[PDB]
Design a protein around this ligand. Structure first.
Ligand SMILES: [Zn+2]
Ligand SMILES: [Zn+2]
Ligand SMILES: [Zn+2]
Lengths: 46, 152, 550, 458
């Protein structure tokens, strides 16, 4: 349910729901990026 | 939970003879189930019967008739007789009263044993013994024995 | 009629109710706060505790060891019993037991005192207190110290002792821990009962256990003898806890309401303390430290394990192992799983589905929480350095918590988090006192506070109220808050230890049954009401009276 | 001043347990079951006796379900959510777990296969279970202001309960199904000296030797390399067979597997695991060591390990039907084809109910002043009625279905006695001294004081 996006301009942690427009809540920039996943990221060092 | 076979095509309803011997009248919106064409049924002589097999009725309320197998159940068999005029020849008889005439999928795992030990992957496909693990670090998907996998 | 008070502890009472022709003991409470004055029992001979400097009195140096300015007795931790000599315990007929915390010292009454009566308690109180007695006896008898120190329990010497040891009361009545055969003999004479079950005692009084809501199996008692009822309200909870909710309706129209087991440190929100516990645990294990949680194997540990289960996925602490080391740990978890009929409607709706009632069971199958009988067996092979350990006795005098504090107290990254309100936090830390460990005190007492008990007494309206003296006074930590006391329209009845209360609530009108042979022979003469003159022979059998026509 | 009892269900028959009791102006139905073997709409009891197009909530103050057997609980969703009943349905906690899954199984049987037109759906099964109030052992629950019922351990199945229905000084004890001999997973029936006005008991009718012979047969067949295919039809028989097998396999310490099938026996295993306090003394006492229903030898059968070769034990889902006939045909004419009904065929039967001597013992130990017989065969009821009226000298009754039976009772008036007069009567006479006093028969209460207290308070 709670989804976080990162604004492309001001780099703000943005809690928004679904079906509401992609709109930064304090600078109005309309491009946001997903945060890095919380799953296990393991690489061999080759 | 109940299957059936339609005996008559009507404009807004389906006339379906289920395992009752009674014809029901239901609306169009029934669902469809995949028929088990390779199912095995057993008669009173414990002989194997399958689809499109002629069987005789020797017990039940309608003993004496003869039918052909169309669909199968755990303890029931569907019968057809072209000389029988009720409900288009559809009928049902019990099987024993006749005679012949994974959770691992999508889970992140660690290979804890073997040459790929320490590799982290996601199970794409799995069986009782082996599992297809999509390795996070490489582009490979490898077959790993499930005794060498640890869910992380 | 009369009410003897064998214990001065508010949450660990032992009250003997001399009611009509039957003598009822309401709970038996072992005061384990007496153990705080003793030096802790370690699993291995720690260098720090062994060569502590002795304390000298100019009048004993081997008996007393001083650690960081506090003097500790170097004997086995002894337990303050209920006072067993005011009333002869062979004259009491029935012991009613409310909590498993209030079932300790039952081997002391049932064996050493000549008590030949019967004991009533619910299934989970008996089983869980059996587990707690087992781990207490085990903890005392793992590495047996001797009862060497005896001179300090003297009236001439204890006056001269410093304040933590001088203030100890009834020191001559303190006794060593009972053994396991005494536990078995004490628990063999318990008659098991269920909630809202009528128990007739010699045809005179009727006792039922009513659900209290504090712990699973914990029960309040009402004692009815015809047209008079005594309500015993022990430790009860009005919050959304796992056991069955408090039965407030059956306590109504009671002539005297004996209440005990209120909240220690009432100025604490238990939900806020759960939040503080989870936040401090996450902060410690995020820094690479270690969390030690001294707790009982049953009780609040289930609630905080539920909240930690809901918290680890949110905080991302799935890599932090949770260790539960106790000799009765596995039995405690299994007993919590199978006592679903004694839980609230939310928990026992889960077992209608094929599902465990407590969510901590899923932690074993996901291997998040690992439980061990002891440190030595296989915990020493499955130990990861950033971890959380629920272990030991909360008194910090015996159990595996002593070894863990001796191991982890030299580092400031490690923390100890206190959730049990039973023992004084400062006195618990006092024998370990030169420690760099951060100590977090967040007690999660979920019992009745004073606004809750004011609402309960307004709802029930008992004719008389009997409470300990500490509930009438403000707590000495506050000593000014007038809302932290019991206030009723009658100004209660306070008692101290070894005090006898006379209850003037005795009335006339004992009930009788008249057979229809006499009922026809009595003419209902008109008075306006009716009057009739009866001549019958009185038949009494099993304290029940009958009227027979001559 | 009468107790009227009308069994609308069983009477002098087996199955469809439904007994109406009208003690002291309050009407209680004692079971609500269905009659297996009938398909002509006589499965559900005739509720037209109580109300003909009337509200059953007003007529019935309480509905009691003894245990989860379909002849005692199968008609409950119909009776609630089709006829109309939103009152209290009192039931035992393990019964409330097993009853939805056995009702759904018979709903699966009757709606899919064998002729159910007027029946109940799964949604109204859940609706009926939503009205169920669960009770514990020996818990006196107050359904009304003066009517209270109390459950006693019956030991027939898991959570089978004997109910005492007490209102005022008059009490009726109904024992649905019970067994006075303990099983390997259940205890025996127990009742205190209630001395009720009426004991409604079942009347329809060595064990160690039978169990030893069954174990010897199983061991001899599995040590010869063959595989057994013992079927189970009831849940209690299945759990008893599994626990007796598991302790035998653990005692002999042989590792050839034992398997059980179906998605319903697994649910029964889980519910039996979750209800340890409703089991035998051994399971409760040795639970701290290990859960005996967490089987270390009996495992889930993935088509009986895909019917692999070798010696193994397989539990069939029915006692015929599917999931047993395939195994029976696949193993006919084999080395050891031992199939033990309740191609070598053995006969090992385990009694789930009480025999005649158990009923005699229950009547002797509860000690009622009248006995009523249901749930059995008419000849056996006549023989047991003769035994009751001969050996214990207490009235027995023979009601059929729909046949009311009324009983006269003598209530005792509760009167208060002034304590001074009572202590005076304790003083003199203890050394046939008469008690002379005045009965102030006021409104809604009775006091019996001395003449001095009568004149000073006149
Ligand atoms: Zn922005
Ligand atoms: Zn039955
Ligand atoms: Zn039965």
């Amino acid at each position: 349910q709670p989804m976080i996006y990162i604004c492309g301009e001001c780099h703000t942690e943005n809690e928004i729901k679904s079906r509401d427009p992609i709109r930064c809540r304090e600078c109005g920039y309309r491009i946001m990026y997903k945060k890095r996943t919380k799953r296990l990221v393991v690489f061999d060092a080759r | 939970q109940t299957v059936g076979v339609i005996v008559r095509l009507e404009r807004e309803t389906f006339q379906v003879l289920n395992m009752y011997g009674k014809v029901v009248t239901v609306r169009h919106q029934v669902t469809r189930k995949k028929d088990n064409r390779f199912a095995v049924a057993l008669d009173s002589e414990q002989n194997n019967i399958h689809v499109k097999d002629i069987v005789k009725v020797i017990d039940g309320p309608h003993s004496g008739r003869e039918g052909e197998i169309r669909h199968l159940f755990r303890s029931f068999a569907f019968l057809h007789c072209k000389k029988l005029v009720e409900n288009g020849g559809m009928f049902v008889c019990k099987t024993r009263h006749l005679v012949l005439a994974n959770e691992l999928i999508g889970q992140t795992v660690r290979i804890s044993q073997g040459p790929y030990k320490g590799y982290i992957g996601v199970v794409k496909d799995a069986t009782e013994s082996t599992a297809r693990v999509e390795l996070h670090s490489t582009c490979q998907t490898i077959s790993v024995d499930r005794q060498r996998l640890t869910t992380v | 009629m009369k009410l003897y008070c064998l214990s001065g502890h508010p949450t660990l009472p032992c009250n003997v109710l001399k009611f009509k022709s039957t003598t009822i003991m309401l709970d038996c409470g072992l005061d384990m706060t007496s153990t705080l004055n003793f030096l802790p029992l370690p699993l291995v001979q720690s260098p720090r505790l062994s060569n502590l400097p002795g304390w000298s009195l100019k009048d004993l140096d081997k008996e007393l060891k001083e650690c960081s300015g506090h003097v500790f007795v170097d004997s086995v931790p002894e337990f303050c019993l209920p006072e067993t000599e005011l009333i002869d315990l062979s004259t009491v007929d029935v012991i009613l037991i409310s909590n498993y915390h209030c079932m300790m010292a039952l081997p002391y009454i049932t064996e050493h005192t000549g008590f030949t009566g019967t004991v009533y308690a619910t299934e989970p109180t008996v089983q869980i207190g059996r587990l707690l007695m087992e781990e207490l006896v085990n903890f005392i008898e793992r590495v047996p110290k001797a009862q060497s120190a005896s001179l300090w329990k003297n009236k001439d010497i204890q006056r001269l002792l410093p304040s933590p040891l001088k203030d100890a009361v009834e020191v001559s009545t303190w006794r060593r821990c009972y053994t396991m055969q005494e536990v078995n003999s004490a628990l063999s004479k318990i008659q098991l009962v269920g909630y809202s079950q009528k128990i007739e005692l010699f045809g005179a009084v009727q006792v039922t256990p009513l659900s209290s809501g504090y712990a699973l199996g914990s029960s309040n008692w009402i004692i009815q003898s015809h047209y008079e009822k005594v309500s015993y309200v022990s430790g009860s909870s009005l919050l959304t806890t796992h056991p069955q909710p408090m039965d407030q309706a059956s306590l109504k129209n009671s002539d005297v309401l004996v209440l005990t087991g209120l909240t220690q440190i009432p100025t604490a929100n238990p939900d806020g303390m759960v939040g503080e516990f989870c936040s401090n645990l996450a902060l410690t294990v995020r820094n690479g430290g270690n969390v030690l949680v001294p707790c009982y194997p049953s009780g609040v540990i289930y609630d905080l394990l539920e909240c930690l289960y809901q918290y680890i996925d949110s905080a991302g602490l799935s890599s932090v192992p949770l260790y539960f080391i106790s000799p009765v740990a596995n039995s405690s978890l299994e007993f919590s799983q199978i006592f679903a009929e004694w839980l609230c409607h939310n928990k026992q709706s889960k077992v209608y589905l094929p599902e465990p009632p407590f969510p901590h069971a899923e932690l074993i199958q996901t291997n998040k929480l690992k439980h061990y009988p002891s440190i030595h067996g296989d915990f020493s092979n499955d130990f990861r350095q950033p971890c959380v350990v629920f272990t030991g006795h909360p008194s910090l005098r015996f159990g595996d918590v002593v070894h863990f504090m001796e191991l982890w107290g030299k580092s400031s990254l490690n923390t100890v988090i206190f959730t049990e309100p039973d023992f004084s936090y400062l006195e618990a830390l006092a024998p370990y006192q030169p420690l760099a460990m951060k100590c977090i005190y967040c007690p999660i007492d979920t019992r009745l506070n004073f606004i809750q008990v004011s609402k309960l007494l307004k709802e029930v309206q008992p004719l008389h109220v009997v409470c300990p003296e500490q509930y009438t006074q403000p707590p000495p930590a506050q000593s000014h808050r007038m809302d932290l006391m019991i206030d009723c329209q009658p100004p209660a009845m306070s008692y101290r230890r070894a005090e006898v209360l006379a209850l003037p609530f005795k009335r006339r009108y004992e009930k009788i049954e008249i057979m229809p042979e006499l009922a026809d022979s009595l003419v209902p003469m008109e008075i306006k009401i009716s009057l009739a003159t009866v001549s019958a022979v009185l038949h009494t059998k099993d304290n029940k009276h009958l009227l027979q026509p001559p | 001043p009468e107790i009227r009892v009308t069994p609308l269900g069983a009477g002098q028959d087996v199955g469809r347990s439904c007994i109406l009791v009208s003690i002291a102006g309050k009407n209680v139905m004692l079971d609500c079951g269905m009659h297996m073997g009938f398909n002509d709409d006589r499965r559900f009891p005739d509720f037209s006796y109580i109300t003909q197009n009337g509200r059953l909530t007003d007529f019935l103050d309480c509905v009691i379900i003894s245990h989860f057997h379909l002849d005692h609980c199968g008609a409950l969703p119909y009776f609630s959510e089709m006829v109309g009943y939103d009152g209290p349905i009192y039931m035992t906690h393990p019964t409330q777990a097993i009853c939805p899954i056995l009702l759904e199984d018979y709903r699966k049987i009757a709606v899919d296969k064998k002729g159910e037109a007027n029946f109940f759906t799964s949604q109204m099964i859940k609706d009926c279970m939503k009205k169920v109030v669960a009770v514990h052992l020996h818990q006196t629950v107050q359904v009304d202001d003066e009517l209270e019922i109390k459950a006693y351990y019956a030991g027939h199945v898991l959570g089978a309960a004997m109910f005492q229905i007490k209102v005022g000084s008059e009490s009726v004890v109904y024992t649905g199904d019970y067994n006075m001999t303990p099983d390997r997973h259940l205890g025996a029936a127990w009742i205190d000296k209630c001395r009720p006005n009426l004991l409604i008991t079942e009347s329809t009718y060595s064990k160690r030797c039978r169990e030893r012979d069954f174990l010897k047969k199983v061991h001899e067949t599995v040590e010869r390399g063959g595989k057994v295919l013992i079927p189970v039809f009831a849940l209690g028989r299945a759990q008893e067979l599994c626990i007796l097998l598991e302790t035998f396999w653990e005692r002999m310490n042989l590792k050839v597997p034992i398997y059980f099938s179906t998605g319903l026996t697994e649910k029964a295993n889980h519910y039996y695991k979750l209800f340890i306090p409703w089991t035998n003394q051994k399971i409760r006492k040795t639970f701290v060591q290990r859960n005996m229903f967490e089987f270390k030898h009996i495992k889930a059968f993935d088509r009986a390990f895909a019917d692999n070769p070798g010696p193994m034990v397989v539990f069939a889902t029915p006692g015929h039907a599917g999931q047993s006939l395939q195994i029976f045909r696949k193993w006919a004419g084999n080395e050891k084809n031992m199939v033990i009904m309740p191609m070598q065929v053995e006969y090992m039967s385990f009694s789930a109910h009480a025999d005649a001597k158990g009923i005699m013992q229950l009547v002797g130990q509860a000690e009622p002043e009248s006995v009523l017989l249901v749930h059995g065969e008419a000849k056996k009821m006549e023989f047991l009625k003769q035994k009751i009226e001969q050996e214990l000298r207490v009235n027995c009754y023979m009601p059929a279905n729909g046949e009311t039976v009324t009983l006269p009772t003598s209530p005792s008036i509760p009167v208060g006695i002034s304590l001074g007069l009572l202590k005076r009567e304790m003083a003199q006479g203890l050394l046939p001294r008469l008690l002379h006093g005045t009965l102030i028969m006021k409104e809604s209460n009775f006091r019996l004081v001395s003449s001095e207290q009568a004149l000073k308070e006149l």
